[PDB]
Design a protein around this motif. Structure first.
Motif, short mmCIF file in Angstrom:
data_model
loop_
_atom_site.label_atom_id
_atom_site.label_comp_id
_atom_site.label_asym_id
_atom_site.label_seq_id
_atom_site.Cartn_x
_atom_site.Cartn_y
_atom_site.Cartn_z
N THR D 330 60.32 179.28 62.24
CA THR D 330 60.90 179.17 63.57
C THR D 330 61.04 177.71 63.98
OG1 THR D 330 60.51 179.62 65.93
CG2 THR D 330 58.58 179.78 64.44
N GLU D 331 62.27 177.23 64.04
CA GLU D 331 62.58 175.92 64.57
C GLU D 331 62.72 176.02 66.08
OE1 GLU D 331 63.14 172.91 63.12
OE2 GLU D 331 64.46 171.80 64.47
N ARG D 332 62.09 175.08 66.77
CA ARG D 332 61.96 175.06 68.22
C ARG D 332 63.26 174.63 68.88
NH1 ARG D 332 59.84 178.55 70.96
NH2 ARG D 332 57.79 179.10 70.09
N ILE D 333 63.18 174.06 70.09
CA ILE D 333 64.25 173.84 71.06
C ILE D 333 65.47 173.06 70.55
CG2 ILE D 333 62.72 174.02 73.01
CD1 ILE D 333 62.41 171.06 73.01
N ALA D 334 65.61 172.95 69.23
CA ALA D 334 66.37 171.99 68.43
C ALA D 334 67.60 171.37 69.07
CB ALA D 334 66.80 172.67 67.14
N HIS D 335 68.42 172.15 69.77
CA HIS D 335 69.54 171.50 70.44
C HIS D 335 69.15 170.76 71.71
CE1 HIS D 335 73.50 172.17 68.61
NE2 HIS D 335 72.90 173.15 67.96
N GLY D 336 67.87 170.53 71.96
CA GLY D 336 67.45 169.70 73.07
C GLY D 336 67.40 170.46 74.38
N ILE D 337 66.67 169.90 75.34
CA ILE D 337 66.59 170.52 76.65
C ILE D 337 67.81 170.09 77.44
CG2 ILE D 337 64.10 170.36 76.47
CD1 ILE D 337 64.22 168.36 78.79
N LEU D 338 68.06 170.76 78.55
CA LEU D 338 69.25 170.54 79.34
C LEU D 338 69.03 169.37 80.29
CD1 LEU D 338 71.98 172.21 79.62
CD2 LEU D 338 70.85 173.39 81.48
N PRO D 339 70.11 168.73 80.76
CA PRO D 339 69.96 167.75 81.83
C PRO D 339 69.40 168.38 83.10
CG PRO D 339 72.00 167.36 80.72
CD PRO D 339 71.39 168.57 80.05
N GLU D 340 68.80 167.53 83.92
CA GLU D 340 68.09 167.72 85.17
C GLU D 340 69.08 167.70 86.34
OE1 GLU D 340 64.97 164.93 85.48
OE2 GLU D 340 64.25 165.59 87.45
N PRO D 341 68.88 168.53 87.36
CA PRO D 341 69.75 168.47 88.54
C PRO D 341 69.58 167.15 89.28
CG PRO D 341 68.55 170.54 88.47
CD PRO D 341 67.95 169.68 87.42
N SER D 342 70.66 166.70 89.91
CA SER D 342 70.59 165.47 90.67
C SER D 342 69.92 165.71 92.01
CB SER D 342 71.99 164.89 90.89
OG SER D 342 71.95 163.88 91.88
N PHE D 343 69.16 164.71 92.47
CA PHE D 343 68.25 164.91 93.60
C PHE D 343 69.00 165.15 94.90
CE2 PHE D 343 68.54 160.52 92.17
CZ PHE D 343 69.16 159.92 93.25
N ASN D 344 70.13 164.46 95.10
CA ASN D 344 70.94 164.70 96.28
C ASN D 344 71.53 166.11 96.24
OD1 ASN D 344 72.48 164.12 94.08
ND2 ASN D 344 73.62 162.43 95.02
N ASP D 345 71.94 166.56 95.06
CA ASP D 345 72.47 167.91 94.91
C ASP D 345 71.40 168.96 95.17
OD1 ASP D 345 74.45 166.25 94.07
OD2 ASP D 345 74.63 167.08 92.04
N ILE D 346 70.16 168.68 94.77
CA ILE D 346 69.13 169.70 94.91
C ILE D 346 68.54 169.71 96.31
CG2 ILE D 346 67.03 168.47 94.30
CD1 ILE D 346 68.16 171.88 93.03
N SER D 347 68.71 168.64 97.09
CA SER D 347 68.11 168.58 98.41
C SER D 347 69.11 168.82 99.53
CB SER D 347 67.44 167.22 98.61
OG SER D 347 68.43 166.20 98.63
N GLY D 348 70.19 168.05 99.58
CA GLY D 348 70.97 168.01 100.81
C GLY D 348 70.20 167.36 101.94
N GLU D 349 69.32 166.42 101.63
CA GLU D 349 68.39 165.83 102.58
C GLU D 349 68.45 164.31 102.47
OE1 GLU D 349 64.31 166.57 102.03
OE2 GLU D 349 64.00 167.45 104.01
N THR D 350 67.80 163.63 103.41
CA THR D 350 67.86 162.18 103.45
C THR D 350 66.72 161.49 102.71
OG1 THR D 350 66.62 162.08 105.52
CG2 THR D 350 69.01 162.33 105.66
N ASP D 351 65.52 162.05 102.74
CA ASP D 351 64.35 161.39 102.18
C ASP D 351 64.36 161.54 100.66
OD1 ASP D 351 63.98 161.45 104.91
OD2 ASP D 351 62.56 163.12 104.79
N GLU D 352 64.61 160.43 99.96
CA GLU D 352 64.75 160.43 98.51
C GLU D 352 63.49 160.95 97.82
OE1 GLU D 352 67.37 159.00 96.62
OE2 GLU D 352 66.42 158.95 94.64
N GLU D 353 62.32 160.58 98.34
CA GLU D 353 61.08 161.10 97.79
C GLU D 353 60.97 162.61 97.96
OE1 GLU D 353 58.48 161.65 95.57
OE2 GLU D 353 59.08 159.55 95.67
#
Lengths: 123, 67, 54, 465, 46
Positions: D330-353
């Motif tokens: 069994t070969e693992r995740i071989a094609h790599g993990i997916l990119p991460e959502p962008s923080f502005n897209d995931i929040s819709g909020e002002t505070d970057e942290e």
RNA sequence: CAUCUAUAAUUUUGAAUAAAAAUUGUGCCGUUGCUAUGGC
């Protein structure tokens, strides 16, 4: 310092179990697909538990649901991909929120009760 | 769109009586229990033997029909 | 009309197991899950064809 | 004039050619070559170019098509028939012309010529289905309109070069002729849910294994234009299927996570389950990261008549042998993990942290799927692809208990729907050609979070040595 | 007819904007403008 | 599929318009040039 807004989020094994009961319920017509249909089932009182995607853009559009869940004592989970939720839901398009409704003469009764027990101890 | 389908199973050669003995499983969807003579013909042209030499007997159709 | 896997089962007291529980479906020879319609349906089609032909 | 002297003369000309090439290589060998040319049929792998390949300077190419979401592609290649030395192809003008047949969700079936390894696929002919093929009566007994009217979902070109079969969500199999693309015959699956989801011709034969999504595997015979047998046994939909020279097919059904091998004459189905445990995996790494549960199972390919590889949608590429039930590798995740959502897209909020703390870090990552998979028959090399923008070519170690990664090919941009291999040149140095149909969305649904920099194309890659 | 359908589309999108605007802690006109541009592009589609 | 007709290149008069014998990457938009391609 605080929790993320998505929390509680599910482990991968619980996620597999959740999506299995999601697909069998969609096969047997027990599953309401979408945030509006989920909110309508929460108002009508017919829902058994809620699944919610924890990565939609942005998170608040379905974050309106846990308030109704807490006020009416329904358990809810947050799975980490609306893509996989739409796939295991049987839609040709990602779903961000699903509601497994209640039934008494349902073939999957102990399957739903097993996963819902897992969710209630997850909370 | 119909097709009889013959599948022999457990072919046992027997040089004592100079023959082969097996079990014949027939599939015949949308069809009612294909004739023994036609099965003799098809088995003969499968095993390259003679219709006057091949022999079949003792058939049983499954419940529901189609084998 | 109902077949568990491939066998057209016609007993209403069958006591299915789990694999059967997932495999129950309409039989492939029925007019509900397969070939040509029943005698009532094709007789109605025949008499309608006749009443249009005369 | 007699068949004995004709076959003797053809065999003697074959022997002259083999002896002459033996001379040109000497500037035993004939017995070994003949043993190979028969030993194609039985048993394990023998093609051993796992190290001969040069993926570095393998010349890549992309062509774009004017229709959206290519679904599948099947390539036809004439091979000299070893028992009687005529040819595989049907005509005389074909003279060993390689063809490709693509099918796309715009209800289009296209035939390209690909016999020239230098130039690009040349679009010979095309055919299009529309709303003028909707059946009038909804009785489903006759679904027999002569064209496709819903979402052609796979294709398969016959090894005798006479026909090509197209299947789709319109629960039909339409078999067309290859030269004029005229539909010679049409077979409904006769079911309210029997959508055709994959096809496979039995290798070098006429049988046809069409795996359909009423959990069933139908088996047709083409030159008679009939249906032989419906095989039952899957719980969830049977999504993909592979076949070889023997009468064994192999199917993968998705959410029940099973690979079933069907021996058709013995009428016996073997099952194979996986079942990795991330607790055991995490403690097996603590005995010294991200571990994903088996989400589904999507693609299959049978490498020889005793082993086959299976690609899931949680990154696992597994190798199974007919002896052990559990996966032998069994070969693992071989094609790599997916990119991460962008923080502005995931929040819709002002505070970057706060956007970051709702991006949550590690608990939100997902792996790349395995959209397509293909093994070269009786070889030890296979190709795996997804929307990670790069095909990966892998080589099985000759103990046939593990495999490793030969290389990458970065000509890909989009979802790799289908991978195919065509060989040419002499038996000494064979030129390989990878043809992959690549699209913007998946085969079945849409489901895909808007892959950037992706076109509807046919990606060629010519490899040598 | 098209007026009724476009008003229904606007109702869906204003509901979504209400969701994000309440349950964020300090809301954002970028997603406001995203939804507005989407409704305007749909209007151009009609 | 074979055969034949014409289109595509040659045999000959031939600078040839010309008359003669036979054969065998795109649905739309945009960039880049001695073919590569970015958006929908």
């Amino acid at each position: 310092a605080p929790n993320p807004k998505a929390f509680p989020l599910a482990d991968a094994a619980l996620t597999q179990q959740i999506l299995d009961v999601v697909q069998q319920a969609a096969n047997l017509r027990q599953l309401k697909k979408g945030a509006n249909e989920a909110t309508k089932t929460l108002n009508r009182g017919i829902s058994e538990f809620i699944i919610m995607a924890a990565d939609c853009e942005p998170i608040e559009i379905l974050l309106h649901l846990p308030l109704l869940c807490e006020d009416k004592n329904v358990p809810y989970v947050f799975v980490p991909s609306r893509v996989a939720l739409g796939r295991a839901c049987g839609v040709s398009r990602p779903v961000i929120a699903a509601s497994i409704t209640t039934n008494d003469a349902s073939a999957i009764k102990t399957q739903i009760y097993a996963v819902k027990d897992k969710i209630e101890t997850l909370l | 769109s119909d097709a009889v389908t013959i599948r022999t199973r457990k072919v046992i050669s027997n040089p004592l009586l100079a023959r082969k003995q097996f079990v014949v499983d027939v599939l015949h969807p949308n069809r009612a229990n294909v004739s023994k003579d036609e099965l003799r013909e098809k088995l003969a042209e499968v095993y390259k033997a003679e219709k006057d030499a091949v022999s079949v007997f003792g058939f049983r159709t499954q419940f529901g029909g189609g084998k | 009309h109902i077949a568990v896997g491939k066998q057209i089962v016609n007993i209403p007291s069958f006591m299915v197991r789990l694999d059967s529980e997932k495999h129950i479906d309409f039989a492939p020879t029925s007019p509900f899950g397969g070939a040509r319609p029943g005698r009532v349906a094709r007789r109605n089609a025949a008499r309608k064809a006749e009443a249009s032909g005369e | 004039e007699n068949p004995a002297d004709k076959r003797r003369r053809l065999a003697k000309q074959y022997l002259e050619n083999l002896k002459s090439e033996a001379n040109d290589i000497l500037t035993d060998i004939i017995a070994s070559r003949l043993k190979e040319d028969v030993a194609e049929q039985q048993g394990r792998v023998f093609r051993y170019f796992g190290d001969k390949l040069l993926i570095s300077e393998a010349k890549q190419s992309f062509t774009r098509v004017g229709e959206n979401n290519l679904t599948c592609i099947s390539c036809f290649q004439p091979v000299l028939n070893k028992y009687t030395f005529e040819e595989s192809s049907n005509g005389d003008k074909n003279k060993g012309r390689l063809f490709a047949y693509t099918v796309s969700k715009d209800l289009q079936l296209t035939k390209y010529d690909i016999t020239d390894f230098s130039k690009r696929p040349k679009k010979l002919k095309y055919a299009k289905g529309g709303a003028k093929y909707i059946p009038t009566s909804k009785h489903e007994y006759e679904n027999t309109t002569e064209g496709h009217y819903d979402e052609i979902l796979t294709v398969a070109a016959s090894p005798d070069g006479k026909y090509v079969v197209t299947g789709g969500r319109d629960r039909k199999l339409i078999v067309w002729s290859t030269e004029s693309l005229s539909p010679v015959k049409v077979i409904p699956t006769k079911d309210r849910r029997g959508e055709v989801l994959s096809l496979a011709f039995r290798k070098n034969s006429d049988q046809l294994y069409a795996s359909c999504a009423d959990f069933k595997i139908r088996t047709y015979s083409i030159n008679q234009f009939s249906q032989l047998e419906i095989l039952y046994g899957h719980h969830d939909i049977v999504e993909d299927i592979s076949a070889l020279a023997m009468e064994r097919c192999v199917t993968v059904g998705a959410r029940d996570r099973t690979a079933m091998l069907w021996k058709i004459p013995d009428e016996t189905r073997l099952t194979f389950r996986g079942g990795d445990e991330p607790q055991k995996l995490l403690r097996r790494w603590m005995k010294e990261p991200l571990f994903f549960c088996e989400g589904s199972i999507d693609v299959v390919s049978m490498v020889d008549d005793f082993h086959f590889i299976t690609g899931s949608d949680n990154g696992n590429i597994c190798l199974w042998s007919l002896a052990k039930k559990k996966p032998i590798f069994t070969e693992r995740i071989a094609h790599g993990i997916l990119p991460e959502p962008s923080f502005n897209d995931i929040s819709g909020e002002t505070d970057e942290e706060l956007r970051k703390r709702q991006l949550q870090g590690k608990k939100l990552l997902q792996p790349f799927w395995i959209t397509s998979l293909y093994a070269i028959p009786y070889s030890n090399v296979f190709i795996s692809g997804s929307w990670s923008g790069s095909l990966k070519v892998w080589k099985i170690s000759d103990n046939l208990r593990s495999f490793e990664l030969l290389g990458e090919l970065s000509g890909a941009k989009g979802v790799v729907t289908k991978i195919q291999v065509v060989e040419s040149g002499k038996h000494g140095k064979e030129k390989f050609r990878i043809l992959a149909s690549i699209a913007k969305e998946h085969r079945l649904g849409r489901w895909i979070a808007n892959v950037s920099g992706a076109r509807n194309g046919i990606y060629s890659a010519v490899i040598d040595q | 007819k098209n007026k009724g359908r476009i008003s229904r589309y606007l109702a869906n999108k204003c509901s979504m904007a209400s969701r994000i605007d309440n349950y964020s802690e300090e809301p954002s006109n970028v997603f406001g403008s995203v939804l507005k541009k989407q409704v305007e592009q749909r209007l151009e589609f009609y």
